[PDB]
Ligand binder design. Structure first.
Ligand SMILES: *[C@H](c1[nH]c(/C=C2\NC(=O)C(CC)=C2C)c(C)c1CCC(=O)O)c1[nH]c(C[C@H]2NC(=O)C(C)=C2[C@@H](*)C)c(C)c1CCC(=O)O
Length: 165
């Protein structure tokens, strides 16, 4: 086919593991889910990490046209939402029944914007019990997640961006 080996390109699935691997390791979280955004405002769980006893996803599509719909522009500004006890935020119906089965007890959304575009979003959840992510923990999330954007940014464009370098 081609004289070019895949070795020239790294597995997109691997780079993801680093973000989720560190997030749960460095922060010592129970469960954390990460999915890339699509053109239909629908996410895609390309990588997920959950402790033993919890439900694993991966290859699942997140369809929640609530925040990703309106809060979108808000995320572009780098807005975040921190809810320790989801029982105080989201007195909805399907939502509660949607998380119940997941035993999700938390709410941390960190906006990921590449080239000024919402490519993905990092969400952490404490399956065990509610938790409060300190402002410092958010800062780390930004740098941790931000680093990922750089990876995808490179693969996105590199063949010809700045010859002068
Ligand atoms: C807003 C809303 N949806 C989501 C999506 C998720 N949170 C999760 O933990 C998970 C997977 C484990 C998903 C997926 C978030 C984070 C938010 C915002 C948080 C908030 O402050 O409310 C939202 N969802 C619903 C229920 C309904 N809407 C949907 O998109 C789907 C799908 C539903 C069930 C069929 C509601 C009522 C809201 C709040 C509306 C608003 O304030 O704009």
């Amino acid at each position: 086919m081609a004289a070019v080996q895949l070795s020239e390109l790294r597995d997109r699935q691997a780079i993801f593991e680093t973000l989720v691997a560190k997030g749960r390791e460095l922060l010592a979280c129970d469960r954390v889910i990460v999915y890339a955004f699509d053109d239909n405002y629908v996410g895609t769980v390309v990588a997920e990490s959950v402790a033993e006893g919890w439900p694993q996803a991966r290859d699942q599509v997140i369809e929640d046209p609530c925040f990703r719909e309106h809060w979108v522009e808000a995320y572009r500004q780098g807005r975040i939402q921190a809810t320790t006890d989801i029982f105080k935020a989201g007195l909805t119906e399907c939502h509660l029944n949607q998380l119940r089965p997941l035993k999700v007890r938390a709410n941390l959304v960190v906006p990921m914007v590449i080239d000024d575009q919402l490519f993905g979003l990092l969400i952490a959840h404490q399956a065990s019990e509610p938790r409060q992510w300190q402002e410092i923990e958010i800062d780390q999330f930004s740098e941790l997640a931000s680093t990922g954007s750089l990876v995808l940014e490179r693969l996105h464009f590199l063949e010809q961006t700045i010859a002068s370098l």
